[PDB]
From Swiss-Prot, chain B:
It is an enzyme of class 2 (transferase). Keywords: ATP-binding, Magnesium, Nucleotide-binding, Transferase, tRNA processing. This is tRNA dimethylallyltransferase. One of its GO terms (biological process) is tRNA modification. Its EC number is 2.5.1.75. The gene is miaA. Substrate binds at residues 11-16. The lineage of its organism: Bacteria, Bacillati, Bacillota, Bacilli, Bacillales. It catalyses: adenosine(37) in tRNA + dimethylallyl diphosphate = N(6)-dimethylallyladenosine(37) in tRNA + diphosphate.
């Protein structure tokens, strides 16, 4: 069993710092689970971790996609899974940090994510069927398990029937995981979120959004993110600059509240309240818990 | 457009002879449309055409697949379509003879025959949706498109809800062709079909089945054919020999009646009655009609 630590939680709770400090005394590398951190050229609107924040700790899945490309949960899982092994090959401890429920669960649970495709074998026996019988017999076979659907297509249209049948056919954690969550009192988290927005505006979020806008990026996953869409409406002349800023802040607060509720609903997640800035004591408490659970799970497995 | 002559009709109506005679005075080649003719070693049970019956006319798609292999309509189409072009490259007229409606229609219509897969983008769209909005919102989405399935899945099971929405989203002639059909009076056709069966028994059908049976062939396309399956029940000891022969004859007649119904239902099929009539006179009538229609369609196309 491969050991994996996951750090989840809303935005602005100190998920980056606690992760770099834990990876330092635990000899680990970080796998980014934030789907927005993958787009290069977009550093401000996405609050991208700086090389100075990594402080030696190697991070992966950052700046690997162009703002015009998409990055689905399947893409994430295909890259992340191999990484966990490659990091272990180095003798380091893999750290999965941040991300939405979809991307995180896809890795910790190793879901299928395979495409929904028909089985060519079944199509063959369906063709052999109409070959031996007729287009009426096949159609009846459809009415014997779905009269409504069959009463919708023409019994002579054996082409659709075979499809309706092939579709009607489709119808009917492995890792040594340790997952912790970082919370914080409501009012405090929101103030840091609003100030986060002012910072982006101060650093030049508007320019960053105009660059993308000018290059013709529109209706893409990158630009639809809850930190670029507000600036786009402004550039479109649909809202005032102050309205967009107020909307961005609100959307970020709504988003953080939604991310907490989600992970708070996840079982097997040990929460830590970061309301107090006493890092030295908390990080030491978190490392002890993580280091311990990994070891007792390893022993139990052995 | 590329020219293509199709000769369709049930079994025992003289589809072979009339086709080789037509191809002689029309400088053509024959493409076998009978899926069973592809399996080598199965000559009797499939009433395979002999080199002598071909009488010089070249035939394709005969004896190209081992009885253990499968041969779908798609396989046939990928082999016939290119062949029609290769026959035209030689300056000959391609003839699609016999076969079941499935194989002939797929060729004369160039059906896509493409697989069915769920667009990876729509799935991406749903995941983004479930993350941008409640998990029950994604549930309400499906509930408005199919409340029955919705009420059948807990809203917290977004994975199963995404699956339902993807499945739902799934369900949301180039040739200058002349098609002729050969028919015959009911009673006459049936008797010729029964005698065809006895002929097979006389030539060695049973032995032919025993060889495929003995080599271990079972539950394959080849052996599931309406002329080898009856013998297999006998060989399995589920039915008496006389019962198999009687059942084979019946299934053979039932299958002819179905083949006729299918083609009779195809528009643009000019029929000809072969009921114990004068051959020399019929073939001459059929050639005139075929040769003429091909030319008037060609002229019309020149416009």
């Amino acid at each position: 069993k491969e050991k994996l630590v996951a750090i989840v939680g809303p935005t602005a709770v100190g998920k980056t710092k606690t992760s770099v400090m834990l990876a330092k005394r635990l000899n680990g590398e970080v796998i980014s689970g934030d789907s927005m951190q993958v787009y290069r050229g977009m550093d401000i609107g996405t609050a991208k971790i700086t090389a100075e924040e990594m402080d030696g700790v190697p991070h992966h899945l950052i700046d690997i996609k162009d703002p015009s490309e998409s990055f689905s949960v399947a893409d994430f899982q295909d890259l992340a899974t191999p990484l966990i092994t490659e990091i272990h090959e180095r003798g380091r401890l893999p750290f999965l940090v941040g991300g939405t429920g979809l991307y995180v669960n896809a890795v910790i649970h190793q879901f299928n994510l395979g495409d929904i495709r028909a089985d060519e074998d079944y199509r063959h026996e369906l063709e052999a069927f109409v070959n031996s019988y007729g287009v009426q017999a096949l159609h009846d076979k459809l009415s014997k398990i779905d009269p409504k659907a069959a009463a919708a297509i023409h019994p002579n249209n054996y082409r659709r029937v075979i499809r309706a049948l092939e579709i009607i056919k489709l119808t009917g954690s492995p890792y040594n995981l340790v997952m912790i969550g970082l919370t914080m009192e409501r009012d405090v988290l929101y103030d840091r979120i609003n100030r986060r927005v002012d910072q982006m505006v101060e650093e030049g979020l508007i320019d960053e959004a105009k660059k993308l806008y000018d290059r013709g990026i529109r209706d893409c996953q990158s630009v639809q993110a809850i930190g670029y869409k507000e600036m786009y409406d402004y550039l479109d002349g649909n809202v005032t600059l102050e309205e967009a800023i107020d909307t961005l802040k609100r959307n970020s607060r709504r988003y953080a509240k939604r991310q907490l509720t989600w992970f708070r609903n996840k079982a097997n997640v040990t929460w830590f309240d970061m309301t107090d800035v006493d890092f030295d004591k908390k990080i030491m408490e978190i490392h002890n818990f993580i280091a311990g659970k990994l070891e007792e799970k390893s022993k139990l497995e052995h």
